[PDB]
Amino acid sequence: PQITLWKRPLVTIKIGGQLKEALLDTGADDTVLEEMNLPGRWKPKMIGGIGGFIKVRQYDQILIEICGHKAIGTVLVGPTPVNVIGRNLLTQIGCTLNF
Amino acid sequence: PQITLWKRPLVTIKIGGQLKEALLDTGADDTVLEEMNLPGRWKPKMIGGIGGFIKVRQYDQILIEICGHKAIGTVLVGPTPVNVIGRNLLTQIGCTLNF
Numbered sequence: 654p655q656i657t658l659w660k661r662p663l664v665t666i667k668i669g670g671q672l673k674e675a676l677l678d679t680g681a682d683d684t685v686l687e688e689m690n691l692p693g694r695w696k697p698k699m700i701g702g703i704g705g706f707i708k709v710r711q712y713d714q715i716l717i718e719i720c721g722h723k724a725i726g727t728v729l730v731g732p733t734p735v736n737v738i739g740r741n742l743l744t745q746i747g748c749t750l751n752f
Numbered sequence: 753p754q755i756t757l758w759k760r761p762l763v764t765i766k767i768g769g770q771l772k773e774a775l776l777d778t779g780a781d782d783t784v785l786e787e788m789n790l791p792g793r794w795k796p797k798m799i800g801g802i803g804g805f806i807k808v809r810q811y812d813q814i815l816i817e818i819c820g821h822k823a824i825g826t827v828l829v830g831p832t833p834v835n836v837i838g839r840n841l842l843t844q845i846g847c848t849l850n851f
């Protein structure tokens with residue numbers, strides 16, 4: 654589909670058997686999701702943006718569906734105010750910027 | 753143009769007569785540029801990101817050309833980690849997401 658940017662580009666995602674809302678974020682290198690108790694191992698990480706850094710847990714090879722488009726890759730979990738789908742997954746669903 | 757997301761969507765912008773690199777950031781409501789000198793009046797404002805809130809100077813009705821496309825709107829100036837072009841200007845240049 655084509656998504657205009659009059660409002661936040663929010664879409665439903667499926668991760669770890671849960672449905673959530675997340676932003677298609679071209680400015681996000683990685684995918685950062687609200688706190689959730691995913692199973693499996695992880696590695697600590699810190700990511701920076703406006704305001705500073707937050708601590709997150711890096712899970713690798715996570716299955717995630719975005720508008721029926723399946724992907725698999727790294728997902729960061731931490732106290733983020735918003736769920737953001739980053740370029741690591743946007744590339745896997747064929748998402749582009751067009752103007 | 754059509755921009756894939758295998759790399760950061762960085763483009764050249766012209767603002768205040770000066771060229772700069774900036775990130776096309778669909779996850780940002782507003783446009784935030786690193787510290788610089790801009791003419792005209794400004795108002796102190798607060799903006800929050802993933803890591804908290806920063807202090808910015810709000811410039812209204814600023815001319816800014818993004819990848820050859822002209823826009824006129826609000827530009828926030830402050831200690832952002834990178835120059836980001838937010839939806840307030842992405843809509844003006846006709847930018848949409850497509851997958």
Ligand SMILES: CC[C@H](C)CN(C[C@@H](O)[C@H](Cc1ccccc1)NC(=O)O[C@H]1CO[C@H]2OCC[C@H]21)S(=O)(=O)c1ccc2ncsc2c1
Pocket residue numbers: 678680681682683684685700701702703734735737739775777778779780781782783784799800801802803833834836838
């Ligand atoms: C360094 C470049 C930008 C700031 C990076 N951000 C993505 C960005 O889209 C962010 C995503 C975001 C959106 C909403 C709340 C918190 C973060 N939006 C944002 O900060 O926008 C601000 C400016 O306009 C306003 O509207 C939204 C907040 C304001 S981010 O959330 O901090 C982010 C995401 C993945 C990631 N992987 C490595 S670093 C890193 C940083």
